[PDB]
């Protein structure tokens, strides 16, 4: 299937309580492999997956210096954005950055992205061609022209189409026994009557990887998303994920409703009945 390497940057300003806090994490598909916390004692990039540990000391020193450098730039950014919007120094603000590359089944470059957010809302993001910018407001227009004079998009594209695909391939090979497994979900069905004549049909999917999955509740064989409840996919904590979907029905009529499981680790999509 497909694969992705993504990095996430966060920096929260704390007026009156010191420097802003910087947190950075890196992901390979739904598997986190590194982290940095500017508030920790480590003051170093740290492994968070077994397959990344084999990288030598030159790797960890280089990732620490840059995440330290990106730390400070996002510190300056909080002041710059505070000026762009004429905000006061008293409030706490959030700045977020995400970038990464996507590759297909043949592990060849498929998609790149580089985005930036301020206080949870879109600010600036690299367009799909990796040559142009999407600016959200007039302050992001200043950033856009600033980065156009600095040729930022051209230098990001060289990384996202080169370095990021090649190091993602390296991780995928070096961690094949973990990153390339496909845990098929284990599915069962709970029953919990609500009310005399209506009762919940909850379709369960447990212990699957990767996180992507599709659960649908049908009527007679055709779907009905009227009484369907659907929780967000959640981590089980041991590397796998969980999800369920529920519906209410009239009683004695519980076996017109079917549940359909779609997952890459399933050769056949599953149907369940009661």
């Amino acid at each position: 299937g497909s694969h992705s390497m993504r990095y996430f940057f966060t920096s929260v300003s704390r007026p009156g309580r010191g420097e802003p806090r910087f947190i950075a994490v890196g992901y390979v598909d739904d598997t986190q492999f590194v982290r940095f916390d500017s508030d920790a004692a480590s003051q170093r990039m740290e492994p968070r997956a077994p397959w990344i540990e084999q990288e030598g000391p030159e790797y960890w020193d280089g990732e620490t210096r840059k995440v330290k450098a990106h730390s400070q730039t996002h510190r300056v950014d909080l002041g710059t954005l505070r000026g762009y919007y004429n905000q006061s120094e008293a409030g706490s603000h959030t700045v977020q950055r995400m970038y990464g590359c996507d590759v297909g089944s043949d592990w060849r470059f498929l998609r790149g992205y580089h985005q930036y957010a301020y206080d949870g809302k879109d600010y600036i993001a690299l367009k799909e061609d990796l040559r142009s910018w999407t600016a959200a407001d007039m302050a992001a227009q200043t950033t856009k022209h600033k980065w156009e004079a600095a040729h930022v998009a051209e230098q990001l594209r060289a990384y996202l189409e080169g370095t990021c695909v090649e190091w993602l391939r390296r991780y995928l090979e070096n961690g094949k026994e973990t990153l390339q497994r496909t845990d098929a979900p284990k599915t069962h069905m709970t029953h919990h009557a609500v009310s005399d004549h209506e009762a919940t049909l909850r379709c369960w999917a447990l212990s699957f990887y990767p996180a992507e999955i599709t659960l649908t509740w049908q009527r007679d064989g055709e779907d009905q998303t009227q009484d369907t409840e659907l929780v967000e996919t959640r981590p089980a904590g041991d590397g796998t994920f969980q999800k369920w979907a529920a519906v209410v029905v009239p009683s004695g009529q519980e076996q017109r409703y079917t549940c359909h499981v779609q997952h890459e680790g399933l050769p056949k999509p599953l149907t369940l009945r009661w």
Binding site: H70, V76, T80, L81, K146, A150, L156, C164
Partner: peptide, 9 residues
């Protein structure tokens, strides 16, 4: 692996 380029908003 991180990208080295430092960018300022």
């Amino acid at each position: 692996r991180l990208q080295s380029l430092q960018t300022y908003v």
